[PDB]
Design a protein around this motif. Structure first.
Motif, PDB file in Angstrom:
ATOM      1  N   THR A 112       8.691   8.276   6.371  1.00  0.00           N
ATOM      2  CA  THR A 112       8.130   6.965   6.681  1.00  0.00           C
ATOM      3  C   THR A 112       6.664   6.884   6.272  1.00  0.00           C
ATOM      4  O   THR A 112       6.235   5.904   5.651  1.00  0.00           O
ATOM      5  CB  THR A 112       8.292   6.670   8.170  1.00  0.00           C
ATOM      6  OG1 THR A 112       9.676   6.457   8.466  1.00  0.00           O
ATOM      7  CG2 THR A 112       7.504   5.436   8.556  1.00  0.00           C
ATOM      8  N   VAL A 116       6.333   6.631   2.510  1.00  0.00           N
ATOM      9  CA  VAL A 116       6.654   5.295   2.011  1.00  0.00           C
ATOM     10  C   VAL A 116       5.510   4.323   2.288  1.00  0.00           C
ATOM     11  O   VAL A 116       5.131   3.526   1.417  1.00  0.00           O
ATOM     12  CB  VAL A 116       7.978   4.799   2.618  1.00  0.00           C
ATOM     13  CG1 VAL A 116       8.179   3.330   2.318  1.00  0.00           C
ATOM     14  CG2 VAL A 116       9.137   5.609   2.074  1.00  0.00           C
ATOM     15  N   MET A 130       2.302   4.929   2.638  1.00  0.00           N
ATOM     16  CA  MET A 130       1.142   5.166   1.784  1.00  0.00           C
ATOM     17  C   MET A 130       1.447   4.856   0.324  1.00  0.00           C
ATOM     18  O   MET A 130       0.548   4.467  -0.429  1.00  0.00           O
ATOM     19  CB  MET A 130       0.638   6.597   1.938  1.00  0.00           C
ATOM     20  CG  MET A 130       0.066   6.890   3.308  1.00  0.00           C
ATOM     21  SD  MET A 130      -0.579   8.561   3.433  1.00  0.00           S
ATOM     22  CE  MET A 130       0.949   9.477   3.509  1.00  0.00           C
ATOM     23  N   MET A 131       2.700   5.022  -0.103  1.00  0.00           N
ATOM     24  CA  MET A 131       3.037   4.697  -1.483  1.00  0.00           C
ATOM     25  C   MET A 131       3.044   3.195  -1.724  1.00  0.00           C
ATOM     26  O   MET A 131       2.744   2.750  -2.837  1.00  0.00           O
ATOM     27  CB  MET A 131       4.387   5.302  -1.853  1.00  0.00           C
ATOM     28  CG  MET A 131       4.429   5.899  -3.245  1.00  0.00           C
ATOM     29  SD  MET A 131       3.135   7.121  -3.522  1.00  0.00           S
ATOM     30  CE  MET A 131       3.654   8.431  -2.421  1.00  0.00           C
ATOM     31  N   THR A 132       3.381   2.399  -0.708  1.00  0.00           N
ATOM     32  CA  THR A 132       3.376   0.950  -0.891  1.00  0.00           C
ATOM     33  C   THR A 132       1.974   0.363  -1.005  1.00  0.00           C
ATOM     34  O   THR A 132       1.847  -0.819  -1.335  1.00  0.00           O
ATOM     35  CB  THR A 132       4.111   0.253   0.255  1.00  0.00           C
ATOM     36  OG1 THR A 132       3.587   0.705   1.510  1.00  0.00           O
ATOM     37  CG2 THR A 132       5.599   0.541   0.191  1.00  0.00           C
ATOM     38  N   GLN A 153      -0.278  -0.545  -5.074  1.00  0.00           N
ATOM     39  CA  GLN A 153       0.200  -1.532  -6.035  1.00  0.00           C
ATOM     40  C   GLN A 153      -0.921  -2.380  -6.639  1.00  0.00           C
ATOM     41  O   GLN A 153      -0.851  -2.704  -7.832  1.00  0.00           O
ATOM     42  CB  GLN A 153       1.253  -2.429  -5.385  1.00  0.00           C
ATOM     43  CG  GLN A 153       2.412  -1.661  -4.775  1.00  0.00           C
ATOM     44  CD  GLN A 153       3.144  -0.811  -5.793  1.00  0.00           C
ATOM     45  OE1 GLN A 153       3.339  -1.222  -6.936  1.00  0.00           O
ATOM     46  NE2 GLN A 153       3.552   0.383  -5.384  1.00  0.00           N
ATOM     47  N   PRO A 154      -1.948  -2.783  -5.882  1.00  0.00           N
ATOM     48  CA  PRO A 154      -3.082  -3.470  -6.524  1.00  0.00           C
ATOM     49  C   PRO A 154      -3.826  -2.620  -7.541  1.00  0.00           C
ATOM     50  O   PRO A 154      -4.515  -3.180  -8.402  1.00  0.00           O
ATOM     51  CB  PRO A 154      -3.986  -3.848  -5.342  1.00  0.00           C
ATOM     52  CG  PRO A 154      -3.502  -3.039  -4.195  1.00  0.00           C
ATOM     53  CD  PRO A 154      -2.042  -2.880  -4.416  1.00  0.00           C
ATOM     54  N   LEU A 155      -3.717  -1.294  -7.477  1.00  0.00           N
ATOM     55  CA  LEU A 155      -4.385  -0.405  -8.417  1.00  0.00           C
ATOM     56  C   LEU A 155      -3.542  -0.117  -9.652  1.00  0.00           C
ATOM     57  O   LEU A 155      -3.849   0.822 -10.394  1.00  0.00           O
ATOM     58  CB  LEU A 155      -4.755   0.910  -7.729  1.00  0.00           C
ATOM     59  CG  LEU A 155      -6.173   1.059  -7.176  1.00  0.00           C
ATOM     60  CD1 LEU A 155      -6.408   0.098  -6.028  1.00  0.00           C
ATOM     61  CD2 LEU A 155      -6.421   2.489  -6.733  1.00  0.00           C
TER      62      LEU A 155
END
Lengths: 103, 140, 287, 156, 49, 52, 49
Positions: free
Chosen positions: E17, E20, E22-24, E27-29
């Motif tokens: 969890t 997931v 921290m991976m989400t 996206q802006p980068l």
């Protein structure tokens, strides 16, 4: 032919060792007379025995509460085992990135 | 974190002595890989937490420099380097170099081109075969 | 600047693998009750365990000038005959000693012509192979003082300023406590000019009717007036005033002399020795 | 770092399987009352159960130097004749002993020339097949103290 | 045993969890032309265990 | 604050344009070429196949 | 009888609901070219039982 520990029979070993339980039964009978007198009956009781109510009702609540909570903690609905396999032994034997998951 | 709130001697009399015995016996049995020749707590339970905090702070500060990407008077690559150095965190593989970018450009170009070609090829084949079938069936 | 921060990470890691955090906590607690301690930093090695040691006040000697310079240090250790290195054992005949007899060793450091010298001595004889030299700014022995005066060796403590208050608090609390074990003893008092007999009240049962009167029985008690509130309030005030002096991310939020007598001397011995060991790059000359 | 993490994971899993968490909780309660305990770690194997063991203060003896080194350790156990391993049982005569009789077993560890030595003695003789040695920093007998004073065996 | 039995299957769930979540947040980068994303992901995974 | 590497000089602002122009001129060309080649091959393949 | 009977179907229902909730949150990461989704889903399903 029943050499050791069994050279005298089954009803003979049971009679010698029967005198080692004496203190524990007495102490348990003393304990189970202020909480629930019918929890640990003697070995000479029958239909006519009458169990009397203690003057206070604090032991029963505590004993029932602890007995409930201990079983709630020890035995949950979900499994309480894992059955794991050692690591680094899949690694030295596998050839793909989807072996540990399948195991 | 709740397991790291201390409202020292037993880390030299119960913990380090138990790890130095199991790294000798398990290796001699063939249950651990053979460690190279010569190469507890207080800063171990936080050993990974410190890295997590540093990386999170770095990401948070890198997120905020996106509005300034259209300013023609700022040297962004050096500003990022100074921001990284102000934290003390390592900069091994967090920034790209003068090389290893043309490769990225080439990869992007090829990845786009293959799909763009395939889609048009399929569409034209389908249109041609449909027209042929229709012109053959239109006299039934 | 990027290259200068690697060298600061290599230094902090060397002080966590070789356990430097246990001696420091013990040292910081001797400084408050006595005011003195000594620290030794053994010479580093590539692949061994070399922890840091600490000495109490009853095991070393120092001599200082009136200006505040250090001139002499001597220490004392006690070891058995089987814990000694074999080279030192080679110079002593084994027949005289037993595997459980304690020897005494000494260390001497003195100043001569802008440098330091050292040796070791056992049984009045100097051990060969222990001589050496140190620079004038990288001596690995660090005497520490907490409160510094003018013209004295050693230092004074911090708890020394608050001894009268602790003594007074203990004096009052002892009496307050001991006036409570006297007020829990039962003694009846019957009147010798009445009609009730203490023999009938003792042989009765749980519910009975017996002959007597209630004006002839009373119990002894401690009738002390307003001599409890006064002592209690004074003791409370003393405790409150003692609580304000011992303080009874957030690093800079909480919070001077101990940065010139403990922190800077440790950093100047580590960079002198790790360069020679071969663990950090050769720094430029002055820079 | 990947391999360095994998090794820690394996070390944790092994200590989880062979239950080490029951003796430790017991040991931490004897330190607050008496201040002393001992721990023993048996040799690992591949498919057998090898749990940890704990001794109280009334079952072992330690001698220490004034500097703080360890020179000698001796322990005592009481086992029955029928529970002894057959290899040890092969150096005694079975006629003299009946089942349920008890024997006393002694173990001695001492220091000699930068290492440790070990042997086992029963009755009045030394059992063959128990000799060994340990490195100076990997002795599997760990005496534990809580409060350490100067020049004194055992802690407070 | 039971010290880690309910959490024996729960530690994995908590770690996954957190991974997931921290991976989400990267996206802006995705369009930054100066950051080596795969190595950053590898270091972030290593920092957890 | 030190202003060593936080502002761009009058020179050294030409390389930025050179780099961005190169990126655009490569990406656009590759994208345009791929689709045209795919459509050209697909048209002929369909024309040859659909006869039967 | 009642060991796992009254919750006999509820135990299945809760697990299925949690699985759906976990699979719902992996939609934003469907355009990341450095992640193996099929194996991540398998490892997420094996951590629930």
């Amino acid at each position: 032919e029943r050499e050791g520990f069994a050279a005298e029979g089954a009803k003979a070993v049971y009679d010698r060792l029967k005198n080692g339980r004496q203190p524990y039964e007495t102490r348990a009978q003393n304990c189970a007379a202020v909480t629930i007198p019918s929890l640990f009956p003697k070995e000479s009781d029958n239909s006519s025995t009458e169990y009397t109510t203690p003057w206070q009702a604090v032991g029963a609540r505590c004993l029932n509460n602890l007995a409930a909570k201990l079983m709630l903690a020890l035995f949950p609905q979900s499994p309480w085992m894992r059955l794991t396999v050692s690591e680094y032994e899949a690694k030295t034997l596998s050839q793909d990135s989807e072996a540990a998951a399948r195991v | 974190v709740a397991g790291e709130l201390e409202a020292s001697v037993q880390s030299q009399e119960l913990q380090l002595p138990i790890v130095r015995v199991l790294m000798n016996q398990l290796q001699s049995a063939g249950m651990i890989p053979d460690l190279p020749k010569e190469a507890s707590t207080g800063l171990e339970a936080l050993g990974r937490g410190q890295d997590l905090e540093k990386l999170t702070q770095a990401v948070n500060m890198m997120t905020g420099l996106q509005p300034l990407s259209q300013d023609p008077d700022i040297n962004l690559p050096t500003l990022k380097l100074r921001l990284l150095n102000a934290l003390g965190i390592d900069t091994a593989g967090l920034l790209l170099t003068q090389d290893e970018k043309i490769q990225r450009m080439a990869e992007q170009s090829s990845q786009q081109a293959v799909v763009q070609g395939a889609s048009a090829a399929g569409a034209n084949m389908g249109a041609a075969v449909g027209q042929g079938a229709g012109e053959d069936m239109a006299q039934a | 600047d990027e290259g200068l921060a690697m060298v600061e990470r290599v230094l902090m890691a060397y002080m966590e693998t070789n356990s430097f955090r246990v001696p420091l906590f013990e040292a910081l607690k001797q400084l408050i009750v006595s005011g003195n301690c000594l620290l030794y930093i053994p010479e580093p090695e590539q692949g061994t365990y070399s922890p840091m040691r600490m000495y109490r006040l009853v095991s070393y000697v120092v001599q200082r000038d009136a200006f505040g310079n250090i001139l002499q240090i001597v220490t004392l250790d006690k070891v058995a005959f089987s814990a000694l290195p074999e080279d030192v054992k080679s110079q002593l005949n084994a027949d005289d000693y037993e595997p459980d007899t304690e020897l005494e060793v000494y260390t001497h450091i003195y100043r001569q012509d802008d440098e330091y010298l050292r040796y070791e001595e056992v049984e009045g004889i100097e051990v060969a192979g222990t001589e050496g030299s140190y620079p004038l700014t990288a001596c690995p022995y660090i005497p520490v003082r907490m409160v510094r005066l003018d013209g004295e060796d050693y230092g004074r403590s911090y708890c020394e300023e608050y001894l009268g208050d602790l003594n007074s608090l203990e004096t009052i609390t002892e009496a307050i406590t001991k006036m409570a074990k006297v007020a829990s003893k039962v003694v009846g008092l019957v009147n010798p000019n009445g009609i009730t007999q203490p023999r009938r009240l003792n042989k009765a049962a749980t519910g009975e009717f017996v002959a007597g009167r209630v004006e002839d029985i009373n119990f002894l008690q401690l009738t002390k007036g307003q001599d409890f509130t006064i002592a209690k309030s004074v003791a409370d005030a003393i405790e409150q005033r003692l609580g304000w002096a011992f303080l009874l991310v957030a690093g800079e939020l909480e919070a001077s002399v101990q940065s010139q007598e403990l922190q800077l001397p440790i950093v100047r011995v580590l960079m002198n020795q790790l360069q020679s060991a071969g663990m950090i790059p050769d720094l430029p000359k002055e820079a």
